[PDB]
Amino acid sequence: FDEVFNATRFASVYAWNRKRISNCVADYSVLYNLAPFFTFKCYGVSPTKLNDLCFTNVYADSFVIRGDEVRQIAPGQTGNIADYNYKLPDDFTGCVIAWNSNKLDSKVSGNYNYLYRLFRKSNLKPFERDISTEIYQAGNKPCNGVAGFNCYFPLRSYSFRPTYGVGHQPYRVVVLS
Amino acid sequence: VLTQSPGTLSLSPGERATLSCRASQSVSSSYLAWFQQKPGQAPRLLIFAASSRAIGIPARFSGSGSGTDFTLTISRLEPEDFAVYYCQQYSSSPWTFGQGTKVEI
Amino acid sequence: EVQLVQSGPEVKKPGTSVKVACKASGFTFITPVSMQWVRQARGQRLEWLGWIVLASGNTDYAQKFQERVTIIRDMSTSTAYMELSRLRTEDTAVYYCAAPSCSRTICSDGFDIWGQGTMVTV
Numbered sequence: 001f002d003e004v005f006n007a008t009r010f011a012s013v014y015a016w017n018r019k020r021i022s023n024c025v026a027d028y029s030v031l032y033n034l035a036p037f038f039t040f041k042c043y044g045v046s047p048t049k050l051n052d053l054c055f056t057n058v059y060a061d062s063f064v065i066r067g068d069e070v071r072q073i074a075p076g077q078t079g080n081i082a083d084y085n086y087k088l089p090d091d092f093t094g095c096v097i098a099w100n101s102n103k104l105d106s107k108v109s110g111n112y113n114y115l116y117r118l119f120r121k122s123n124l125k126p127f128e129r130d131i132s133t134e135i136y137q138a139g140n141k142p143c144n145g146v147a148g149f150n151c152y153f154p155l156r157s158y159s160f161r162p163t164y165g166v167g168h169q170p171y172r173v174v175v176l177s
Numbered sequence: 178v179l180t181q182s183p184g185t186l187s188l189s190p191g192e193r194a195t196l197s198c199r200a201s202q203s204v205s206s207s208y209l210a211w212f213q214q215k216p217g218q219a220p221r222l223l224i225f226a227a228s229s230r231a232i233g234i235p236a237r238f239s240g241s242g243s244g245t246d247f248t249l250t251i252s253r254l255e256p257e258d259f260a261v262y263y264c265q266q267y268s269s270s271p272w273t274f275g276q277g278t279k280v281e282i
Numbered sequence: 283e284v285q286l287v288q289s290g291p292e293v294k295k296p297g298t299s300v301k302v303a304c305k306a307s308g309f310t311f312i313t314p315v316s317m318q319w320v321r322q323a324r325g326q327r328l329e330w331l332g333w334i335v336l337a338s339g340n341t342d343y344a345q346k347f348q349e350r351v352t353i354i355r356d357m358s359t360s361t362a363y364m365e366l367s368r369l370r371t372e373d374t375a376v377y378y379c380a381a382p383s384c385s386r387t388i389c390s391d392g393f394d395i396w397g398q399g400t401m402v403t404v
Binding site: 208210219220221222224225226229231232263265270271272273274275276277 | 327328330342344345346378383390391392393394396397398399
């Protein structure tokens with residue numbers, strides 16, 4: 001689990017990374033070192049049982065989003081991150097973990113290496129991964145692969161600057177399923 | 178550059194107005210637009226995408242043309258149609274209007 | 283209904299700046315809508331100033347007024363602003379905002395919703 005939480009670089013949320021963990025006792029003691037700006041929220045499971053229940057296969061999904069977007073990483077949620085980047089199912093059994101990463105993932109100029117999808121023709125299915133860079137046609141005229149009127153680049157960078165308020169700072173997220 | 182003609186068009190109610198727009202040196206005309214403007218009001222869209230009529234625009238209004246040459250036709254003038262008409266190009270930055278055509282009684 | 287509500291009339295001196303507001307209602311700024319700025323001096327043609335994407339925040343400007351004009355948005359109040367610096371007497375015009383009637387995942391192919399206009403005098 002250290003190789004996921006302590007990973008030097010996380011993924012962009014439109015291109016979220018999935019690690020299968022198998023035959024591991026899950027030492028959650030790594031999570032105590034992430035206090036003081038840590039959202040931990042479990043669904044279908046007690047957080048306390050995760051230490052003892054060695055699930056034969058866990059998926060650890062990992063990505064970066066804004067602080068105000070962390071609330072969209074839950075079952076039944078809607079919004080640009082939930083609908084077009086990372087959807088959980090409504091019967092989701094597992095755990096959402098998110099911590100402030102502003103010291104690692106911001107720069108004074110802005111860090112722009114983290115992206116998100118801002119437009120898609122339809123919402124994602126649960127755990128669907130859309131990495132496509134095709135021009136989003138909002139209009140009734142073909143884009144022909146060119147950005148223009150009703151013709152948008154589907155991905156956008158954030159901006160992660162150290163001086164931004166907590167809701168605009170980068171949060172590293174790990175979802176366990 | 179868009180050039181409209183005529184600059185003024187005097188016509189009775191019930192007559193057919195026909196207004197030209199000519200695109201000059203450059204074209205790429207794929208998002209063409211057409212507007213009515215009344216005194217002291219903002220411009221209202223009549224025709225978009227060369228010929229597609231705007232919502233709530235009467236069936237007497239029709240747009241046509243492609244490449245360099247475009248036309249707005251009003252098949253039977255009503256007293257509320259006496260106004261200045263403007264064409265406007267897109268996907269051709271700066272997004273230019275024509276100079277207008279005044280329709281009057 | 284979608285509506286654009288502009289700020290009231292402005293009187294400025296030459297060399298100063300003006301900042302016209304446009305508050306949009308009835309649609310979310312989450313949609314990739316172009317809000318545009320157009321002006322009209324009395325008895326003159328329509329002049330396009332520039333635009334802003336209401337979802338990404340990307341702008342572009344007509345080359346004549348590219349250095350002075352700055353278009354911005356506030357997502358929290360659903361308000362675009364057009365700021366015009368280094369004002370001249372020739373900048374005396376009604377400034378309009380405009381936007382296309384857009385939906386969650388689909389836009390119209392012409393710009394049909396206009397604000398009522400803001401008279402700027404210089």
